[model samples]
Target: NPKWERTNLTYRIRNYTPQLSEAEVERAIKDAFELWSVASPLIFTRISQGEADINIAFYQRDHGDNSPFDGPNGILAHAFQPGQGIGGDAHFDAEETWTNTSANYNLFLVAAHEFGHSLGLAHSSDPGALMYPNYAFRETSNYSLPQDDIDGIQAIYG
Candidate 1:
């Protein structure tokens, strides 16, 4: 999965506007953040007039990063480790329909997974874990972290 290194972590929302202006999207994103919030003491803030430490933006191919999204087959989204420049940034492929509901690849699920990466979390082998590289939406009852992910995040931010 993900090889994580311990480091001081912080992040902010550069932009959260979405093409789909449905409440589902907003709720999904909030739920995604709540996932990490419950997992650790890490905090996230929304950038107001000032630039945020972690900027989030959506784009298609070659979005100014070394990891260019290869359309639908490749990663739907990705994030960088905490550092300067692109560090702690998360990007999604606008080419794909980022839905907040179960109709498509839930943006919240992917965001949760990507944010995990932003916090130095790697993909989890357990499908139940939120950090799993592959996307899957778990019911509210299944939203808690598995032991593997708990250990992983603890190792870094603990």
Candidate 2:
């Protein structure tokens, strides 16, 4: 139930996945943060370098977090809760093929879900919610935050 004490937060991408272009990664990450920002008072900014509240990175198996990745198609990503040190970091399993469409794994959706954790949100029971543990493809065009997720975030940040 912990939430960020401050409304403003920053995120930095430590590295890029070869599956997506730099611009694609930027757009996906930006749009993912937009989902939470529109629903809550939290604001997110991208930094070119240095530490951030949420540090995003892509890594392969046994990356020293204790929770090592299982490689392609197993675990896509994971994130920590709100706090200091590695608390708000989100790590993606670089083994998975990330895409910008609904057919394959979309970085936008997964990052949004991980960011929910970064902002202290747990999984939702509703399968339609972004915080749901199971990943499903949803239409991205004109995408908006699902009501369940919006309520979940508001319950904390509001």
Candidate 3:
């Protein structure tokens, strides 16, 4: 994980998804933000409108990126590493069913992973770590980040 040079970064959710309500999505995103920012030196500031270091959104297939998403159970979502413009932006597949907790694909789980990429993390795995690949679930609480995960972020963010 190569971290951000600055300790503070701002972000905003450009739009809401049809799957979840606005409040739930914001809570999930905020929790995801807390999950990562705790392990690193970063602090997240959310904006109502305008520019930000990170921009999260939901989209269907062929959503501008050359890598268009398939229907369901395909490419879930993707994000960019730290940079300007499109960098650090995350896009989710709007076609799939989303959930707040245990369901098809949990938004919190997927989001923490993508946010990892947004911070320049590789597709590395820690099993218990959120860095673990998709569909692989561990009997862990959703409230905290794992030790290996914290170590990974601290490596770059320290």
Task: Name the candidate that leads on lDDT.
Answer: 2
Q: What does the lDDT read for residue 149 in candidate 2?
A: 93
- The backbone clash count of each candidate, in order, is 0, 0, 0
TM-score of model number 1: 0.80
Query: How far out, in Å, is residue 29 in model 3?
Result: 0.3
Which candidate do you rate higher for lDDT, 2 or 3? 2
Worst 10 residues of 3 by lDDT: 134-143
lDDT of 2 by residue, 85-122 (tens): 89999999999989998756899999999999999999
Worst 10 residues of 2 by lDDT: 96-105
Ranking by lDDT: 2, 3, 1
The digit string of per-residue lDDT tens for model 1 on 45-114 reads: 5533555555666777897778788776457888888666687778888777766557556777788778
Model 2 local distance difference test score? 0.92
What is candidate 1's CA lDDT for residue 94? 72
Q: Give the TM-score (vs. native) of candidate 3.
A: 0.92
Model 3: per-residue lDDT, tens digit, 74-158? 7888999888888888998888888865777788778888998898877656567778775554433546887888877877776
Highest TM-score model number: 2
